[PDB]
Every structure is written in C-alpha cells, then in structure tokens.
Design an enzyme around this catalytic site. Structure first.
Site, PDB file in Angstrom:
ATOM      1  N   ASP A 158       0.840  -1.200   0.000  1.00 56.33           N
ATOM      2  CA  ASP A 158       0.000   0.000   0.000  1.00 56.33           C
ATOM      3  C   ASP A 158       0.875   1.251   0.000  1.00 56.33           C
ATOM      4  O   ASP A 158       0.665   2.195   0.764  1.00 56.33           O
ATOM      5  CB  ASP A 158      -0.964  -0.017   1.185  1.00 56.33           C
ATOM      6  CG  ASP A 158      -2.091   0.991   1.045  1.00 56.33           C
ATOM      7  OD1 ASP A 158      -2.269   1.569  -0.051  1.00 56.33           O
ATOM      8  OD2 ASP A 158      -2.818   1.186   2.040  1.00 56.33           O
ATOM      9  N   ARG A 162      -0.166   8.990   1.307  1.00 54.38           N
ATOM     10  CA  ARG A 162      -0.884   8.933   2.577  1.00 54.38           C
ATOM     11  C   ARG A 162      -0.213   8.007   3.584  1.00 54.38           C
ATOM     12  O   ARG A 162      -0.469   8.129   4.789  1.00 54.38           O
ATOM     13  CB  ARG A 162      -2.318   8.460   2.348  1.00 54.38           C
ATOM     14  CG  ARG A 162      -2.380   7.081   1.708  1.00 54.38           C
ATOM     15  CD  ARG A 162      -3.803   6.601   1.502  1.00 54.38           C
ATOM     16  NE  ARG A 162      -3.803   5.316   0.816  1.00 54.38           N
ATOM     17  CZ  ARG A 162      -3.740   5.179  -0.501  1.00 54.38           C
ATOM     18  NH1 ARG A 162      -3.744   6.229  -1.308  1.00 54.38           N
ATOM     19  NH2 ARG A 162      -3.655   3.959  -1.023  1.00 54.38           N
TER      20      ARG A 162
END
Ligand SMILES: C=CC(=O)N[C@@](C)(c1ccc(F)cc1)c1cnc(N2CCN(c3ncnn4cc(-c5cnn(C)c5)cc34)CC2)nc1
Ligand SMILES: [Br-]
Length: 277
Positions: A158, A162
């Site tokens: 991931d 962010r």
C-alpha cells in the site's frame, strides 16, 4: 530440508522490547479504524529521566485470537527488520498486564499527502517554503526506505503518499477495499503482490509528490474504461513540476512487464546522481 529460510513471524518475541504499561500516558488519537487505534503517547524513561513522544498501536477491546496474533507477527517482523532512517521504527512493546501495545517512533508532521496539500500554495521550485530540492529529497528517501525493505524480503502493498510520514529534519518514514489507482495491473487482475508491484506504486507516489498531492488519474473514475485503458498501456502524463528525469523513472515504474521495471536499488542510484547535478 536441512537448510530453510527463517520466517521472522515464527520467531519468539524478544523481551528486550518490553516497556512498562504504567509508564505510557496516552494523548491524541492519530488513527482509528475497525481493528483498533493508534495514539500519540508519552513514554517516560524509554531511552531514564526523560520522556519522549511516541506512537502506540493497539487492538480493539477483547479482539479475537487471529487479530492479536497478527499484531504480534507485525511486531516480530519489525524486530527482525532492524532500524532504518526512512521507516517508522519499533521502539518497544507492552505484551503483558493487558492487551498488546506496539510502540513506534512518532512523526510530528503527519502524513506526506496532507503536508504536500497544505504546502501547495507556498511552493516555489527554486529559492520555509517547499521547493524542488525538498521533493527530490522525499523521492530519494522513500526509495532508500523501500530498497531497505526489499533487501529484507518485505513487500509494502500500500505504498502511497498517505502512507509516508514526515518528521523533524525533513525526514520521510514509511509506515504500515483496495487502492486501485496505486496498484500494478497484475495486482488488480491477478491479485499478485511482488517487489515489482511495489515499484509500480512508487511511481504513482512520485506523481503524487510532484503534483503537490493531487489525486492520481484526475477526473477519471474507477470503472471498466479505466481498467481497459491501464491494460492497453495508458499512463498518466507528467506533473508540471516533475523534472524530466523523474518522470522517466515514473514511466519505467509503470512498465506493463514487471521484469522491465527498475528495482528500488536502481532507483536510489538514479536519484542520487540527479541530486549531485
Ligand atoms: C480499519 C483499519 C484499521 O484498523 N487501521 C489501523 C487503525 C489499525 C490500528 C490498530 C491496529 F491494531 C491495527 C490497525 C491504523 C490507523 N492508523 C494508523 N496510522 C499509522 C501510524 N501513524 C503514525 N505513526 C507514527 N507517528 N505518527 C504521527 C502522526 C501524525 C502527526 N500529526 N498528525 C496529524 C498525525 C501519525 C503517526 C498513526 C496512524 N495505523 C493503523
Ligand atoms: Br492523467
């Protein structure tokens, strides 16, 4: 079978990490979700007379056995990894007297995506403003962190702005249904995650970075047309402030053939050369 790979999740927890639960005071909640929360905390005497700010990850009340073992495995993985400047490092844990608490470094400026967005008006390419030199440093540091993770047989799965944190001294640290716009096609189509798919996601991160925190594939929804375009070879155009040599890296990260994508070790060497010139 005499020689086997040592699986760090199978190793016992090392009590050199143990820290007294009574010496932690919780402060603001930094993240919360289904599985639990991550809080800012003060750890008194973690490194004897002084307190330092840390982050503490904890599971939900009376979590099922699979959830607790998963947190322990994540703790064990951090222990085997070792320290690196560009990851959120493990500092300790509380494993008895209550639920498992995992203590990591605290990154005072939060996630890089919101930092880029809040610095977007102040950005100027050349000279407390954000500059191209900063963006190049962030790209270099994230590559060094991922090269370290890759050398340790780890896949992030991931990678995105962010999930990059910023702390004192302009140091970026990597931390941690699906992030479709960050995923390699083979991950989307075949549910395969590899060193090479992480490299694809790093290319998307670079686009985020030099776009000063814009969302990828702007104005394009995730639908049948999107997947068809990605499969056919459509790629994002260059952000306006991305150096040409950085966009070149992005394009190679987005090669449809995972074998033709660069490794993080190669990316690091490339960016190192750019920084000198
Ligand atoms: C539904 C999904 C789910 O369960 N998710 C999680 C909840 C989870 C929680 C417990 C579990 F057992 C399992 C999973 C989960 C939630 N959040 C986070 N993160 C990761 C680490 N982040 C930080 N780490 C170190 N320093 N630091 C400084 C800042 C900062 C500074 N300024 N500002 C504004 C922010 C943020 C950080 C904190 C937020 N991780 C994971
Ligand atoms: Br585009």
């Amino acid at each position: 079978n005499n020689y086997s790979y040592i699986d760090p999740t199978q190793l016992p927890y090392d009590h050199k990490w143990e820290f007294p639960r009574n010496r932690l005071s919780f402060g603001k909640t930094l993240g919360a979700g289904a599985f639990g929360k991550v809080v800012e905390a003060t750890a008194q005497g973690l490194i004897s007379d002084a307190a330092m700010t840390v982050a503490v990850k904890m599971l939900k009340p009376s979590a099922h056995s699979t959830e607790r073992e998963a947190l322990m495995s994540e703790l064990k993985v951090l222990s085997y990894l070792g320290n690196h400047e560009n990851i959120v490092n493990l500092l300790g844990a509380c494993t008895h007297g209550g639920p498992t608490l995992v203590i990591t470094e605290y990154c005072c400026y939060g996630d890089l995506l919101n930092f880029l967005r809040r610095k977007r008006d102040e950005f100027v390419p050349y000279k407390d403003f954000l500059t191209l030199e900063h963006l190049l440093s962030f790209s270099y540091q994230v590559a060094k962190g991922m090269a370290f993770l890759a050398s340790k047989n780890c896949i992030h799965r991931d990678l995105a702005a962010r999930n990059i944190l910023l702390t004192h001294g302009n140091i970026t640290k990597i931390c941690d249904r699906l992030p479709v716009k960050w995923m390699a096609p083979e991950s989307i189509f075949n549910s395969v995650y590899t060193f090479e798919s992480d490299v694809w996601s790093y290319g998307i991160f670079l686009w985020e970075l030099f776009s000063l925190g814009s969302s990828p594939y702007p104005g394009m929804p995730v639908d049948s047309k999107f997947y068809k375009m990605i499969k056919e070879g459509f790629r994002m155009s260059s952000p306006e402030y991305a150096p040409a040599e950085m966009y070149d890296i992005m394009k190679t990260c987005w090669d449809a053939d995972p074998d033709k994508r660069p490794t993080f070790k190669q990316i690091v060497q490339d960016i190192e050369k750019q920084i000198s010139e």
